[PDB]
């Protein structure tokens, strides 16, 4: 079983912006996610604007060309699929939803170090606090976000 | 993507029994729960008393054979693999739990229903009444309870 990615260098494509916030803040989000996972494991992650990566991110609303349809404001927040080609690896992230940079509405860093972790090969975790548990809920104050070591001793026993 | 058995007729074998409940009582809550599905599919399952069943049902406490170890009482209840071959497919139960055939304890038949919709390729649902909701809570009224909406479209999408 395991399933994981065969190699340690990834990269990532944003393919397309949320109008929510601004470029910049997207990636940046984005970037910290990244970082987040790069801190824990030998892996790392290396960008590209064209073409096909392995971790292709996208903003869709509705119907966008997979299995499973969005649902609106709210509900599920986004989605993404274990390691392997194709789409599998893949980032979605529920448009209808409001991104933010910040402790109000859906925080997009705190998304999408979630999804990553499920990009890599995690399954959700029964700690209430870990990064890695199954609902969604906004923090008081961001710079108290941190991996706990469900996450860590999780991701380290895939990689490293 | 789109993980789902390529074939609509499935094995099954209880490979062996938790102390918590009379064998008569597992098997009836195992058949109970794949009655359930085969309710609102075409699919069918035959159950094996030797050997490799498509979906190995077993009872297990912390380490057991795989690369996820059970964490004792409460916290994760049991794990299922997606569809395929070997260890996918499979469903085990963490024996720490007390498993119950009523609406006190861990309820055996909710649960088990709940993993072979895993089994059978599903993720969980935002709807916090359908069977696929990623907590676990008991009800108040065994018979009060039905399949929502949301888990019929999610298997019937899959298979028929
Ligand atoms: C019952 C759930 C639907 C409830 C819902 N949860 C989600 O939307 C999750 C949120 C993930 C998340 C959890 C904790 C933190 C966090 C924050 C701060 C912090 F400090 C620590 C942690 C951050 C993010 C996203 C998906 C859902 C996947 C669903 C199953 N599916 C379908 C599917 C299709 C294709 C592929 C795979 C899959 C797959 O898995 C996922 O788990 O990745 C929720 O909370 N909604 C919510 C909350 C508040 C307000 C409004 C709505
Ligand atoms: C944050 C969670 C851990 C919380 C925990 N949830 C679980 O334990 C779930 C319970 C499933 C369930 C949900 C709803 C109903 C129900 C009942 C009545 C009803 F009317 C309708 C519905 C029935 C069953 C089992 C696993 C967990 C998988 C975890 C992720 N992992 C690891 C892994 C390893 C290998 C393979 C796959 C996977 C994989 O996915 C699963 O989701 O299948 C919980 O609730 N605990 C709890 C609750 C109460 C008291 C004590 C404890
Ligand atoms: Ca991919
Ligand atoms: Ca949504
Ligand atoms: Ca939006
Ligand atoms: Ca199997
Ligand atoms: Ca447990
Ligand atoms: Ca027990
Ligand atoms: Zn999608
Ligand atoms: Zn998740
Ligand atoms: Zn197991
Ligand atoms: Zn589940």
Redesign the pocket.
Known sequence: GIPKWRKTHLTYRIVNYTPDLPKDAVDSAVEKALKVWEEVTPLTFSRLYEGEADIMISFAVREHG???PFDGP????????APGPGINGDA?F?DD?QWTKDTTG??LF??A???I??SLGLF?SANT???????????TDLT??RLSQDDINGIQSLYG
């Open positions: 997979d299995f499973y709210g509900n599920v927040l986004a989605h993404a699929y979605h529920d939803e859906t925080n705190l998304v170090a979630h999804e972790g499920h959700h606090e870990a990064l890695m548990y199954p609902l969604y809920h906004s923090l108290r976000f």
